[PDB]
Nucleic acid binder design. Structure first.
Ligand code: A2G
Ligand code: MG
Ligand code: MG
Ligand code: MG
Ligand code: MG
Ligand code: MG
Ligand code: MG
Ligand code: MG
Ligand code: MG
Ligand code: MG
Ligand code: MG
Ligand code: MG
Ligand code: MG
Ligand code: MG
Ligand code: MG
Ligand code: MG
Ligand code: MG
Ligand code: MG
Ligand code: MG
Ligand code: MG
Ligand code: MG
Ligand code: MG
Ligand code: MG
Ligand code: MG
Ligand code: MG
Ligand code: MG
Ligand code: MG
Ligand code: MG
Ligand code: MG
Ligand code: MG
Ligand code: MG
Ligand code: MG
Ligand code: MG
Ligand code: MG
Ligand code: MG
Ligand code: MG
Ligand code: MG
Ligand code: MG
Ligand code: MG
Ligand code: MG
Ligand code: MG
Ligand code: MG
Ligand code: MG
Lengths: 19, 48, 117, 56, 142, 150, 110, 103
RNA sequence: UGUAACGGGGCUAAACCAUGCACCGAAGCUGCGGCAGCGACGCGCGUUGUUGGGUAGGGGAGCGUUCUGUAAGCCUGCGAAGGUGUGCUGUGAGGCAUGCUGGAGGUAUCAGAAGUGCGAAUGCUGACAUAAGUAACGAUAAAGCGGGUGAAAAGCCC
RNA sequence: CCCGGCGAGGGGAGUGAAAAAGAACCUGAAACCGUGUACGUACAAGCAGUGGGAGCACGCUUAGGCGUGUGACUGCGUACC
């Protein structure tokens, strides 16, 4: 089995923006 | 004539389709619905 | 009428695991990996019942070529000779006699030359 | 960085081929008491090279 | 009955000495490669080394046709980036004359363990003398 | 299934298979995909197809010599020992008795004998005319069955 | 004639104890004790107490000497793991396994 | 001494006393079979090469056993095409015992 | 990035053109044995012709599982189910026998009914791997020694 | 009763039809982890099999082939959904 997932937590880096 | 010597008439009791029970059965995976589109979906199909 | 799958599922997995004995790592222990290995073993087996007939004829011809050249004739001409002499002894037997009875093979080669000359 | 494929029990074994402990080559025997001891170390009762150096 | 297979503990390996003097390189190499594998014996088995030991004498006097003496180029890469080295046939004959027969034969032998084992039975020499009198090598005209 | 309609975790970002209900049939403790309801398993049997079936069965019982015909079949008092004795005299153990008037004494006397059953001509069923080895019908019973089948 | 001593549910991973268990496999009990006495491992203490128990069992129960005995079979099986929660950064939890071992030592004259 | 004869669309090199496994013959177990088409007969030094059937060449054999060979699993598999087929095969054999070889 | 524009070796033919005869070469064709579909033809059984790559998909026929009747029967402590080996057997799903384990259930046949078959769904729950004996042991205010207690003391007590 | 810290744990003894029913207890599958034995493996390149196949070990019911395990070497061969 798998534990209940966590709510969002702080992220170290911004996702790169490709545009 | 006993309760374990009574057979139905030949062809009177045809075995119903069972979809999605393996390759061998011939109704495996897609279950005779084909690939994608409205008609492959649960409750899928246009009105009369 | 609820049906538990345990006994039947166990029997099926064991049957595949039994056919996967001798295979490396997960291929002899892990059903998912073993199943793929037994199917592929089957595919190869079916393919190699045909290749076996090719490989053995290839081996027989190589040996006949060798034992014919020792007697002073090529394979190509030797078989042509035998067919003109109306000799129907097949390559499996020719190859067998080339190894085990070199006197009898020399006799076949002599009949080959006679049919050509 | 992390594995793309689960390393085998075989590969695990091979990495641990250098993990084996080395047993003490041999124990020295004091000349007076007669006790076995680590070479260049005092005995359990407190002897070193036949001399009583520490009391108990 | 099952087809005969040679056994690598009951096979007859014979010693032959060949003079390469004026012999075309490739046309010699094919015969060597044919007699190292075992393709000339009725007992031939692709998975067994049934071939003969061949001593090749006078490898420095091997012949090539056309302008191959100056123009044939042997390339090897050292493994270091930019490490593509080349020697002409004449440079190979001047420096390491044994390698020209060995390279030519190695390329005509099966690739893999058995092929490498077959090559081990080829004893190439530059001069007219070998050290294998003990093995009583028979003369083989190729 | 008892539980909330709360979406277990957010649709996207967690890295887990999207979940909508803790009651999903895919889940342990979840619903049964096609949960059974109470059913009526009863079938329609055409009157003529029922009567034609009994006629076929009763006709087989004659040819297999499983139907025994007697003028009268009763016992003295409601005692199982009396009927048991009468059945080891008439030479049958497993038997279905059809009688004109459902005599209370004969009914009570065959109640604790599991291989023996006692009914009236109107109370015959197709399964009981096949299940039992022998069928012992009174003269009156045959004159009630005929008139009921025709 | 074989005598068995076990330390079941021993607090140590089977990996760590096995290092020490490979030092005395097939040795004489006297030659095994010394080795364990000067092996600087927690597992050396655990396994020494099982070997000493094995010897005691072989002297009291299965009437034998302390001179002829050898460590004939030694093996360490993975015992039940105790599950503990370790708090990591950003309110995330890891599941620590405190691994236990079953330490078996067999001694015999043969 | 050995002879070469064609049976069951194959050829067999055989000597007196040998048991030979052939493709099924419609013959009873114990009854003898006369292979009349012998391709070669070799008596050490003297060798009789036939063109294509030896004059007076005959191999007398005794039918010692009919049977089914080792089970072979025929597996057919078309990856990604939802197609799999499996079939078992056991090929009939007749063990003959070569009683005499006459030319 | 490295020969890198014959697959390679090598080739002055082992190249090219013409001519000829050999041979090799496929799951094609033939031979031998076996199975199945369909149509002829005689009486379910023979002979004969022909066919049998296959996704979506249509048609046909089966295997096994749990439950109901048959069954107050039949098998079973002289060992049931389940587990685990082995041998045999069928075209397949499968079947049968039996050693060991197990210690009380099982169930023929012919019918009847389905929660009836799992490798995938970033499926669900539990268990267990991997990385790995790796990272880390939470403020760089800091310890040292003697004695004590104890199975054991860097950490406890003095 | 014995080893151990007046431990944990275990070995005897005894109970029981059974303790490999010892309470972490009916059965006790699989992944996973070990110990022992046989064979292979330190000049060798890739879906790890398959066709061919030597050698070695073991067991037999011709003293002989056959059965089992292993698989040097070699042809072919880029998982599944
Ligand atoms: C982490 O990513 C989130 C989006 O998921 C935000 O962009 C946030 O600002 C990011 N933080 C950093 C430090 O880049
Ligand atoms: Mg899961
Ligand atoms: Mg289809
Ligand atoms: Mg789809
Ligand atoms: Mg589409
Ligand atoms: Mg569609
Ligand atoms: Mg919907
Ligand atoms: Mg149930
Ligand atoms: Mg296994
Ligand atoms: Mg990837
Ligand atoms: Mg290490
Ligand atoms: Mg190749
Ligand atoms: Mg529920
Ligand atoms: Mg009505
Ligand atoms: Mg917090
Ligand atoms: Mg360049
Ligand atoms: Mg041809
Ligand atoms: Mg072919
Ligand atoms: Mg064909
Ligand atoms: Mg076809
Ligand atoms: Mg088809
Ligand atoms: Mg049950
Ligand atoms: Mg039943
Ligand atoms: Mg289901
Ligand atoms: Mg599963
Ligand atoms: Mg699937
Ligand atoms: Mg983990
Ligand atoms: Mg690391
Ligand atoms: Mg580090
Ligand atoms: Mg660190
Ligand atoms: Mg701290
Ligand atoms: Mg101190
Ligand atoms: Mg302590
Ligand atoms: Mg401190
Ligand atoms: Mg202080
Ligand atoms: Mg105790
Ligand atoms: Mg019980
Ligand atoms: Mg238990
Ligand atoms: Mg297990
Ligand atoms: Mg080596
Ligand atoms: Mg090398
Ligand atoms: Mg490698
Ligand atoms: Mg390949």
């Amino acid at each position: 089995g798998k534990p209940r997932p966590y709510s969002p937590r702080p992220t170290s880096h911004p996702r790169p923006i490709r545009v | 004539m006993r309760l374990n010597t009574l057979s139905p008439a030949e062809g009177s009791k045809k075995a119903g389709k069972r979809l999605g029970r393996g390759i061998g059965s011939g109704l495996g995976k897609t279950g005779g619905r084909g690939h994608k589109g409205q008609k492959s979906r649960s409750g899928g199909g246009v009105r009369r | 009428a609820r049906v538990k799958r345990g006994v039947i599922a166990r029997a099926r997995h064991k049957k595949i695991l039994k056919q996967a004995k001798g295979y490396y790592g997960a291929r002899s222990r892990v059903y998912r990996v073993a199943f793929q290995a037994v199917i592929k073993a089957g595919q190869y087996a079916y393919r190699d019942r045909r290749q076996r007939k090719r490989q053995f004829r290839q081996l027989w011809i190589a040996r006949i070529n060798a034992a014919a050249r020792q007697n002073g004739i090529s394979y190509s001409k030797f078989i042509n000779g035998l067919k003109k002499a109306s000799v129907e002894i097949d390559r499996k037997i020719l190859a067998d006699i080339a190894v085990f009875d070199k006197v009898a093979f020399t006799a076949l080669v002599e009949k080959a030359k006679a049919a050509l000359a | 960085a992390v594995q793309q494929n689960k390393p085998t029990r075989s590969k695990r074994g091979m990495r641990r081929s250098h993990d084996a402990l080395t047993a003490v080559t041999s124990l020295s025997v004091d000349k007076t008491s007669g006790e076995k001891h680590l070479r260049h170390h005092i005995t359990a009762d407190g002897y070193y090279r036949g001399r009583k150096v520490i009391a108990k | 009955m099952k087809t005969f297979t040679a056994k690598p503990e009951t096979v007859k390996r014979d010693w032959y000495v060949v003079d390469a003097t004026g012999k075309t390189l490739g046309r010699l190499a094919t015969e060597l490669a044919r007699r190292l594998r075992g393709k000339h014996k009725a007992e031939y088995t692709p998975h067994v080394d049934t071939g003969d030991y061949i001593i090749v004498l006078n490898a420095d006097k091997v012949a090539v046709t056309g302008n191959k003496r100056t123009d044939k180029v042997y390339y090897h890469h050292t493994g270091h980036i930019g490490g593509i080295k080349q020697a002409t046939f004449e440079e190979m004959i001047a420096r390491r004359p044994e390698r020209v027969i060995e390279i030519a034969v190695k390329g005509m032998l099966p690739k893999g363990p058995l092929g490498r084992a077959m090559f081990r039975k080829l004893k190439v020499y530059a001069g007219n003398e070998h050290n294998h009198a003990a093995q009583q090598p028979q003369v083989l005209d190729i | 299934v008892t539980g909330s309609g709360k979406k277990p975790w957010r649709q996207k970002g967690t890295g887990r298979a999207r979940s909508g209900s803790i009651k999903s049939p895919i889940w342990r403790s979840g619903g049964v995909t096609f949960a059974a309801r109470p059913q009526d398993h009863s079938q329609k049997v055409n009157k003529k197809m029922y009567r034609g079936a009994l006629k076929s069965i009763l006709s087989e019982l004659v040819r297999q010599d499983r139907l025994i015909v007697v003028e009268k079949f009763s016992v003295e008092a409601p005692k199982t020992k009396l009927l048991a004795q009468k059945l080891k005299d008439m030479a049958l153990e497993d038997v279905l008795i059809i009688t004109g008037e459902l005599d209370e004494n004969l009914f009570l006397a065959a109640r604790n004998l599991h291989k023996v059953d006692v009914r009236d001509a109107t109370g015959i069923d197709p399964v009981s005319l096949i299940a039992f080895d022998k069928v012992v019908m009174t003269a009156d019973a045959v004159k009630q069955v005929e008139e009921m089948l025709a | 004639m074989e005598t068995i001593a076990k330390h079941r549910h021993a607090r140590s991973s089977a990996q760590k104890v096995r290092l020490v268990a490979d030092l005395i496999r097939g040795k004489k009990v006297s030659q095994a004790l010394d080795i364990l006495t000067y092996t600087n491992k927690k597992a050396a203490v655990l396994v020494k107490k099982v070997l000493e128990s094995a010897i005691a069992n072989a002297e009291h129960n299965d009437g034998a000497d302390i001179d002829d005995l050898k460590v004939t079979k030694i093996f360490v099986d993975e015992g039940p793991s105790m599950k503990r929660i370790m708090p990591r950064a950003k309110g995330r939890a890891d599941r620590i396994l405190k691994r236990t071992s079953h330490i078996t030592v067999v001694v015999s004259d043969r | 001494m050995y002879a070469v004869f064609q049976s069951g669309g194959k050829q067999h090199r055989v000597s007196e006393g040998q048991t030979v496994r052939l493709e099924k013959l419609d013959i009873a177990t114990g009854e003898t079979v006369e292979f009349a088409e012998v391709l070669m007969i070799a008596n050490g030094e003297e060798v009789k090469i036939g063109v294509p059937f030896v004059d007076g060449g005959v191999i007398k054999a005794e039918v010692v056993a009919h049977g089914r060979g080792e089970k072979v699993k025929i597996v057919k598999f078309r990856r990604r095409k939802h197609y799999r087929k499996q079939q078992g095969h056991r090929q009939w054999f007749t063990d003959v015992k070569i009683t005499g070889i006459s030319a």
